[PDB]
Design a protein around this ligand. Structure first.
Ligand code: HEM
Ligand SMILES: [Ca+2]
Ligand SMILES: [Ca+2]
Ligand SMILES: [Fe+3]
Ligand SMILES: [Fe+3]
Ligand SMILES: [Fe+3]
Ligand SMILES: [Mn+2]
Ligand code: NA
Ligand code: NA
Ligand code: NA
Ligand code: NA
Ligand code: NA
Ligand SMILES: [Zn+2]
Ligand SMILES: [Zn+2]
Ligand SMILES: [Zn+2]
Length: 319
């Protein structure tokens, strides 16, 4: 189909997304950057979608976190999410699409700005949310591995799928875990979608980048980086360690599994067959910049290897 300004897409219904793409690229993502608002919007896709439980209710990727913001943004696990919800809301009103669709669309456009990144499949037509998520459906960084895996499993994800989704922490930072050092990233390359997150979480912790007493925070190996205790555990627990290590220096795997699993998460509470495939509207991401490495001055001996079956790969360090 050929849209009005000449751009093309497989299904004509998708044409409406083009003005939205252009608006959010300039006015949410600061000129198509892989920056703060991209990272926040990607977090939002998760805090919206994971509000889904067959037992407990919540309609998944339904835009409930915007429609029912008054309730949802006050859940403790949602601390800091009000900022991005506030920024996205006017865009939803202005453009003529549901909040559920807008959240997933902004997340997929955002990720496509990141070098090494992917186009997450995107489907258009979610109806408006009809209920707020219950509380206690979002995992917290002080939760156990068993807790996190049981919650994610309740929403439909296997343990390996949890690891794959947490490639998102390759382009991510924390503002609320330690409020003394807001905007401290989880890896040394928060503007590149790469395997550094899986490498650097495996390193022995050395220091706290800010204060020492934050709930859900573990020691970091680098002053410029913060480490969640959930990530410290998932990297090391026998249930997940081998999958975690398998992501290291495996960019095609990170790419493939993150796109596929983000699609599944974007469709929680939804039926793909009542939606329209608009995947080809998402921009082509740039190729990876840089190659997997240990931080300068580190060696293999700084890695806390946790996969019994398979030795950690021989990376070189920045010089
Ligand atoms: C599986 C259990 C998870 C836990 C315990 C967890 C925990 C956290 C925490 C504590 C923060 C920092 C919030 C702040 O203090 O500002 C955060 C940030 C973030 N999370 Fe995770 N998360 C999980 C999974 C996910 C998943 C599945 C996604 C996929 C979209 C996601 C995407 C992000 C992103 C992109 C940020 C960066 C936000 C920013 O830079 O503003 N997280 N996460
Ligand atoms: Ca929701
Ligand atoms: Ca990164
Ligand atoms: Fe509407
Ligand atoms: Fe913030
Ligand atoms: Fe480096
Ligand atoms: Mn942030
Ligand atoms: Na531009
Ligand atoms: Na509506
Ligand atoms: Na909880
Ligand atoms: Na804990
Ligand atoms: Na366990
Ligand atoms: Zn900005
Ligand atoms: Zn912000
Ligand atoms: Zn365990």
């Amino acid at each position: 189909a050929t849209c009005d300004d000449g751009r093309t897409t497989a299904n004509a219904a998708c044409c409406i997304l083009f003005p939205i793409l252009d608006d959010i690229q300039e006015n949410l993502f600061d000129g198509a950057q892989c920056g703060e608002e991209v990272h926040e919007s990607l977090r939002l896709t998760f805090h919206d979608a994971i509000g889904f439980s067959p037992t407990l209710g919540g309609g998944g990727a339904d835009g409930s976190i915007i429609a029912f913001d008054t309730i949802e943004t006050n859940f403790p696990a949602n601390a800091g999410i009000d900022e991005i919800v506030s920024a996205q809301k006017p865009f939803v009103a202005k453009h003529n699409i549901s909040a559920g669709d807008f959240i997933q669309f902004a997340g997929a456009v955002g990720v496509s700005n990141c070098p090494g990144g992917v186009r997450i499949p995107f489907f258009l037509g979610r109806p408006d949310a009809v209920a707020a998520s219950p509380d206690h459906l979002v995992p917290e960084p002080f939760d156990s591995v068993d807790s996190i895996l049981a919650r994610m499993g309740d929403a439909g994800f296997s343990p390996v799928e949890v690891v794959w989704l947490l490639a998102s922490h390759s382009i991510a930072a924390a503002d609320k875990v330690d409020p003394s050092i807001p905007g401290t990233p989880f890896d040394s390359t928060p503007q590149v979608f790469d395997s550094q997150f899986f490498i650097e979480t495996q390193l022995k912790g050395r220091l706290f980048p800010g204060t020492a007493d934050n709930k859900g925070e573990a020691q970091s190996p680098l002053q410029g980086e913060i480490r969640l205790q959930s990530d410290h555990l998932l990297a090391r627990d026998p249930q997940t360690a081998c999958e975690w290590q398998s992501m290291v220096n495996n960019q095609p795997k990170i790419q493939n599994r993150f796109a596929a699993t983000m699609s599944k998460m974007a469709l929680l509470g939804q039926d793909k067959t009542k939606l329209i495939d608009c995947s080809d509207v998402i921009p082509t991401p740039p190729a990876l910049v840089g190659a997997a490495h240990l931080p300068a001055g580190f060696s293999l001996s700084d890695v806390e290897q946790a996969c019994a079956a398979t030795p950690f790969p021989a990376l070189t360090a920045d010089p």
